[PDB]
């Protein structure tokens, strides 16, 4: 039995990166951010700054992708597919931004009470981020948490 | 890719009973009941009446098990185990009541904001309800979706 990552402060080798993301999008997509999260989720939450810098503001995407419309989730998927196409050589930082983007998008859906749409973030991650990139993200989060430890003490 | 069951109105052979329960406890345990549910979840929601009749009120269970305490989830699991060892011959209706019981319990945890504890309901289901009983429950829910239409 694996741990619950909502209030998890670590990221060990035994922890699966995708599962962390599954729970992250479930919890953020259903409960939102006004909740106690652990150091782990708190790090992933910072991916939001990246996403805005790379893909634009959520207010813009919301209008352009018509996120809250019936075709909103399908549009988001096509948009993600378009992003993956258009980027010349994908870096781990693209993948990080992309996650932050999903997070911001899931916020829009939660507020609209389209609660089942958090699933689409996972579908998008699967399309955008391969196992090799998930490893690199996990390695980065592990480093970032080690520094958060130093900062604390 | 399987469907999302939050607003699902059916229950087909291809739908796995455990997965339905996974999502049910996730959604009820995190969002609660003031949400649009499909006919499927609405049926499982009725398991609540069963649970009260068989295991007692949630107010009492909450006090007896001290559900919101640090040991609350472990206590609930113990409770489930005890109840199972105790039942001479387990019926599908015992399993149904037990699910309703988990549902009522998850409500307590949600209100306390112990949001990760919904997982324990699944752990409890796995202990209490074998695949054979899950099939019988699925069969009943399939009938009930029909019975409801009739009415």
Numbering used by the authors:
A (entry chain A): 40 to 192
B (entry chain B): 40 to 190
Quote the study that presented this structure, word for word.
Vaccinia virus, the vaccine used to eradicate smallpox, has about 200 genes, and many of these encode proteins that help the virus evade the host's immune defences. This paper concerns the vaccinia virus proteins A52 and B14, which block signalling pathways leading to the activation of the NF-κB transcription factor and thereby diminish the host immune response to infection. The structures of A52 and B14 are entirely α helical, both comprising seven α helices and adopting the Bcl-2–like fold. We show that both proteins are Bcl-2 family members but lack a surface groove for binding BH3 peptides and, consonant with this, are not anti-apoptotic. Instead these proteins have acquired the ability to inhibit signalling pathways that activate NF-κB.
A52R is an immediate-early VACV gene encoding a 23-kDa intracellular protein (A52) that contributes to virus virulence. A52 functions by inhibiting NF-κB activation downstream of the IL-1 receptor and TLRs via interactions with IRAK2 and TRAF6. The structures of two independent crystal forms of an N-terminal truncated form of A52 comprising residues 37–190 (A52ΔN36) were refined to 1.9 Å and 2.8 Å resolution with residuals R/Rfree = 0.177/0.215 and 0.181/0.192, respectively, with residues 40–189 being observed in electron density maps in both crystal forms. Residue 190 and the first two residues of the polyHis purification tag were also visible in the low-resolution structure. Both crystal forms of A52 contain 2 molecules per asymmetric unit arranged as a dimer, the overall fold (0.32±0.07 Å root-mean-squared displacement [rmsd] over 150 Cα atoms) and dimer interface being highly conserved. The final 46 residues, removed in the A52ΔC46 truncation mutant that abolished TRAF6 binding and the ability to stimulate p38 MAP kinase, comprise the final 6 residues of helix 5 and all of helices 6 and 7. Given that helices 5 and 6 contribute to the central core of the protein, it is unclear whether this truncated protein would be stable and natively folded let alone whether it would dimerise like the native protein (900 Å2 of the 1,300 Å2 of surface area buried by the native dimer interface being abolished by the truncation). Further study is therefore required to identify the binding face of TRAF6 on the surface of A52. Superposition of our structures onto that of myxoma virus M11 in complex with the BH3 peptide of Bak reveals the hydrophobic BH3-peptide binding grooves are occluded in both A52 and B14, but not in N1. Residues 92–94 and 117–122 block the groove in A52, the C-terminal ends of helices 2 and 4 being oriented closer to each other than in M11, thereby narrowing the groove significantly, and the side chains of Q93, F94 and Y118 pointing directly into and filling the groove.
